[PDB]
Amino acid sequence: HQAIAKMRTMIEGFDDISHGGLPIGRSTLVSGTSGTGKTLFSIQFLYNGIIEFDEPGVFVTFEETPQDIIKNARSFGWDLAKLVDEGKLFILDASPDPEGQEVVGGFDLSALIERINYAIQKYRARRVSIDSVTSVFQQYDASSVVRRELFRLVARLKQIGATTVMTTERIEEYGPIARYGVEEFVSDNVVILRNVLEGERRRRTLEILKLRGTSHMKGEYPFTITDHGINIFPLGAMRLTQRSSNVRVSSGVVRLDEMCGGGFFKDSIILATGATGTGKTLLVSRFVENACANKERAILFAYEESRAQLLRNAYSWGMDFEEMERQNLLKIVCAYPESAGLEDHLQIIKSEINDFKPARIAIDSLSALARGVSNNAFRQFVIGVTGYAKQEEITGLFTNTSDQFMGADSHIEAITDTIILLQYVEIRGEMSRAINVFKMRGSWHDKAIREFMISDKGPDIKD
Amino acid sequence: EHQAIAKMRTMIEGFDDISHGGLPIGRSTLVSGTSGTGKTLFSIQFLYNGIIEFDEPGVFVTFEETPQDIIKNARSFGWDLAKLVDEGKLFILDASPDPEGQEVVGGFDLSALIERINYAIQKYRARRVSIDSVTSVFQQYDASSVVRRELFRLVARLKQIGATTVMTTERIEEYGPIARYGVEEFVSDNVVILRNVLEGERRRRTLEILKLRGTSHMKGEYPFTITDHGINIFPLGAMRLTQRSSNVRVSSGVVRLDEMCGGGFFKDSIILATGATGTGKTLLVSRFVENACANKERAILFAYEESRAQLLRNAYSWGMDFEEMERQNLLKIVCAYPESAGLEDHLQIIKSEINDFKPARIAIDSLSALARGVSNNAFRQFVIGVTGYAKQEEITGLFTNTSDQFMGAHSITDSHIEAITDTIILLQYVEMSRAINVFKMRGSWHDKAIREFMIS
Amino acid sequence: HQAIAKMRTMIEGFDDISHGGLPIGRSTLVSGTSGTGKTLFSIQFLYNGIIEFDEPGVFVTFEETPQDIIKNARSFGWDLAKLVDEGKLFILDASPDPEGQEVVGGFDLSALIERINYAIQKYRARRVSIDSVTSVFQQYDASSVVRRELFRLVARLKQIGATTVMTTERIEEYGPIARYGVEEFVSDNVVILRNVLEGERRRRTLEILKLRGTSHMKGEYPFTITDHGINIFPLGAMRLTQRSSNVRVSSGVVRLDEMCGGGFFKDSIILATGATGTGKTLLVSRFVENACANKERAILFAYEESRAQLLRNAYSWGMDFEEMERQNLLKIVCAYPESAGLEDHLQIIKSEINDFKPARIAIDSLSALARGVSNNAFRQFVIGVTGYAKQEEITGLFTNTSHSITDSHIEAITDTIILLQYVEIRGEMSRAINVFKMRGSWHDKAIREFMISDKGPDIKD
Ligand SMILES: Nc1ncnc2c1ncn2[C@@H]1O[C@H](COP(=O)(O)OP(=O)(O)OP(=O)(O)O)[C@@H](O)[C@H]1O
Ligand SMILES: Nc1ncnc2c1ncn2[C@@H]1O[C@H](COP(=O)(O)OP(=O)(O)OP(=O)(O)O)[C@@H](O)[C@H]1O
Ligand SMILES: Nc1ncnc2c1ncn2[C@@H]1O[C@H](COP(=O)(O)OP(=O)(O)OP(=O)(O)O)[C@@H](O)[C@H]1O
């Protein structure tokens, strides 16, 4: 069992799906529709190679000028002009001009490969890419001709030895792998970038169709475009090896801690589900407050309420959130669910965690995030967040909405370690409330369903 | 992050939020869609706004309609394009509006058109260019796919000139190829899709931005409508969760209720009055609206389930002179048929009336009047748009909901909008008689008891 | 804000949808599949201009002959031959010779547009209609040529200054707007006529896709073709829940009136739903009896039962339906749901109302109509009926059988809902009635036991 050597491509998450990067000396065909990030993948591949591994490279372009390639890259802070000046990056301009608008013949790949070979030797390139192969095959439309011409191109690049990422377009999502349907059978490594429209939403995903001679994660995985270009989330690449101790932390409510058998486990995920107005946001406020009381950092993620309202509600319950922010212990992040896809909310949660390094986090509402979201997309989000929170040993508190007043869902409860239910009880013409610890993995919990009140001192559970 | 491309604002309401600053400067934008999606309107409104808002002159290029039709059609929005032409701010160039006394062979001359456009730009010092019917010259040698190369050259030349250009193209199918020839979206740097989707028995217009190079944008489709002022887009995801809050109280108009709410409503709250029909939900709304006017505040009463005549007639019975409050320009009553337009139009109407009247308070006689014949997703988005906007503008909002509207009744909204609502009031039957109860009072304490809803 | 001037281009319901008719001096393209009523639309455009106003017109035909056009028009009572003799209507026959052929193969439109122009001047036409302009383009398989020539045709008609309707054709109902995929990008105003087959039933709808210079209603508006031509239902422009008055009328049952807080609201829509055998028919029969008791006219529409059976069942319940017909107060209209398209049941209700001028109508069963139709068709039917019932100040009592989008919508627009159930209690069957909803009023909200006798419903406490 001799593994094939790979060239690591530090596009976050890609090296996990490709399971070690792209095979060395092989061509990779990246296909997708317009606006799927195909041109970003190509730049990011060369850029990372040049700065991380000091590997010179060549970007061949047919449909853009070097000036826009650089200008667009600069939106990511990727100063490609600098890398060009230093002789690390070379952009090979093979684009058509408005000057000399048309020619008598067609594109010459023999001339092209000679220029690429030269550029590779001159800059000692090991890593190369092509923005559009079809820009050549705008002529030579016969599928039998395209197959041969692509074969020749790939074979020559293989002899040179540079690892190549070449790009092609397709028209339809879930349609043919590539235009003419004779390209994907020539290339050794094929990657699909799609941007699926469902309902009114677009979702970017990445899939590796095949890698000849090597293993890879199979199927479709989500990705987004963020501060450093492409950021892929290979859900399932994380391991189910998270630590689990008997260390406990206070919930912020003394009687609840007793009902929980002495407090929440530090490494647990807690879900507080109940009817609207039963105090879900009260327990969340006390959860992050307790962290700060013990000089621990905590992040409150609000998907319903603005910061101004959270501060006001907290004051009415005796909690000075503004003071906790002044001490740099509490941080509040507010957004509408509709502002971003769930894969971005996941990136936001992770980024805020990496920067603030909290002991605890809380999500004010999962039901806010699930609005208009399919069970698959929502479920993946919840798994990703709780998986990460466990991995980093961050105590996590999430809330949700129960169907108490609605007739006629529990697919994330298998992830949650502790479940607390908040419900209304109508007693003799008055509304009241009751709390119960429904589930508690690893510990005793009170089976009783107990009445509680909410006042300006916060929740107060009675026996 | 070092680079921040300088984008040019279009001032097409909502567009600048989806594009997040407008269109990239000196670059072409491709706008595709089927007939009736508003391509031409977008193309005109772009130049029109530039001219009047930023004093930025521009050139409109036409292959299909004559300058006279462009001008006449613009008048339906009150846009005097003839005036702008006389002043020299707007120039309409005839590219290929063809004469009837046609020759045998013609067209096949995009280079000549580019020279003419360049000239017009230089003469009128244009900063904005808008090209309708760019496919009118792609009807030639289409079978050879020369379109990709011809479009490439046109786009490249426009960049050299430096003017920002909006180009339109054609589609056949709403969810089919981005453009007729399958090449335009690969040549263009910026792609905007205008759809007019027929589903069920209704059409809905939506706008999407795809394929922007070098910059960011919102993704997916956002509903839009066409009003008497042109295109109006509602980018719900652009709404920030940064609304203000305060402990300022406003009276509900009902004394007992103010006590049950712990001292009236919070000024910047959203109140949802949910209950059985006949429990006085519209009585509570009438008092809410009255109180605003009693204190010389402006208020808008939106209605779907009542004719204007009933609102005034029933108000008189109690002792509320709605006509007088209108005479003083404190009260505005806006009656509409809930099914004459889509939810995105009802939202646009609500916003428009608020923008012009500048109310302290608004009320909706029945949200459930709009929550029918539509999906829960469509309705929920409507509610978020209304509540979000009302809070952003610091407008006290009282909306109602009927709990027994249909046999599949629930005591809470089917789409779960109660998480958005800050105060919830239930109206039910008791004893024979009727009662009011504060279910939720976010930010304060409230009376948990259920008691009679006796206004006086 | 200067609105574009419009010609009424009267077609019942059309000018509500188009917000005042068709733009003057511009070409409107009407596209559809075979048998969608395109020719009929074209005839009414010119016919009405001539009869309702005094606007001469030219009908240009390609597919059939003037003789066939006239004969078909006569089925609607439209005497087109007379209008031709008077010099008001002119039919320009551009149809190819059935026997012969031309040595040039094709045909130049420049040879026709002048004949149209000449005819317009000669007859001082204001309205021009071209039926199957497609047949003039059958010679061209190049869509770029079709645009070139169609644009030319439209532009020349504008110079002439005539308002015109061109018809074209498509193959699919939900496919391309026109068969070449270009015409809708040339014409200024586009209207689509489709005839959709679904669930072993077929529907006609009209849509205005666009009007370049103005506004219109959007979406599909169902229509039917009757003895008087095209009749369109502008369902999006009616009062479904709004009312002008606040006065009650008796339901026919005294205790039920009390449960409803003083009776039904006049001009309200009452929906009585329940299990089979619960007494839905009984309340309907009692309702129309009350109308006639007060000398009000009522129409009982029936789908479950024949007239003979309705009279007999009513007689057993103490109601002489035959006497009420003799007094010209009651009318009974019996048909199977399957006997007509759902839009035609609407047209029948509408027509019977227009002639009989009822104070009340009732439908013995809506489920009878729902069972053979799609969910969208049924929702629109109810909207249409409730729209007209309120327009004419008619109290309507409909019944049905005991979430979906269709039923939530229908029940939502309904003002009053009464639930009837037949259940087992203590080893015997027992009946109960409940007022589920009573819009705008106090109501009991308590389930009451009742019995059915030969004296009608008897609600107990
Ligand atoms: N600074 C940024 N922040 C956020 N998103 C960005 C940023 N820069 C670019 N993007 C997104 O990344 C995408 C990059 O597009 P890309 O270069 O992949 O085009 P493409 O799909 O290759 O074009 P074609 O389909 O013609 O090949 C853009 O559509 C844009 O939405
Ligand atoms: N100062 C106070 N005194 C007494 N009760 C209060 C006070 N402040 C808040 N409350 C009560 O505490 C409750 C907190 O509501 P909470 O935000 O937990 O509802 P929720 O279940 O989260 O609903 P949603 O998820 O829709 O926001 C309020 O319903 C309110 O009645
Ligand atoms: N005052 C108005 N109020 C509401 N809607 C209007 C008004 N004026 C025009 N419209 C609508 O706007 C649409 C016009 O957009 P437009 O049709 O010009 O784009 P487009 O012309 O379809 O592109 P193409 O030129 O290929 O047809 C019309 O179909 C009409 O429905």
Ligand SMILES: Nc1ncnc2c1ncn2[C@@H]1O[C@H](COP(=O)(O)OP(=O)(O)OP(=O)(O)O)[C@@H](O)[C@H]1O
């Ligand atoms: N007097 C009438 N009563 C009821 N229906 C009628 C009457 N006359 C015609 N129709 C209906 O109209 C339909 C034909 O309409 P019309 O002639 O307007 O369409 P068309 O232009 O012939 O369509 P195509 O060009 O595809 O044949 C027939 O299917 C017929 O059922």
Ligand SMILES: Nc1ncnc2c1ncn2[C@@H]1O[C@H](COP(=O)(O)OP(=O)(O)OP(=O)(O)O)[C@@H](O)[C@H]1O
């Ligand atoms: N003379 C009568 N005496 C007692 N009960 C009667 C008499 N006539 C009819 N009924 C009862 O009335 C019931 C039928 O009610 P009705 O005909 O008013 O509507 P329905 O039959 O419930 O409607 P559907 O048949 O659609 O369910 C029968 O179950 C029968 O027992």
Ligand SMILES: Nc1ncnc2c1ncn2[C@@H]1O[C@H](COP(=O)(O)OP(=O)(O)O)[C@@H](O)[C@H]1O
């Ligand atoms: N004195 C009163 N006290 C309380 N409620 C009343 C009084 N008089 C009338 N009402 C109710 O106030 C209601 C306002 O309309 P509403 O209940 O909203 O109807 P719907 O809920 O069906 O839209 C009226 O329907 C009426 O029944």
Ligand SMILES: [Mg+2]
């Ligand atoms: Mg690209």
Ligand SMILES: [Mg+2]
């Ligand atoms: Mg909450």
Ligand SMILES: [Mg+2]
């Ligand atoms: Mg009301």
Ligand SMILES: [Mg+2]
């Ligand atoms: Mg015909």
Ligand SMILES: [Mg+2]
């Ligand atoms: Mg029956």
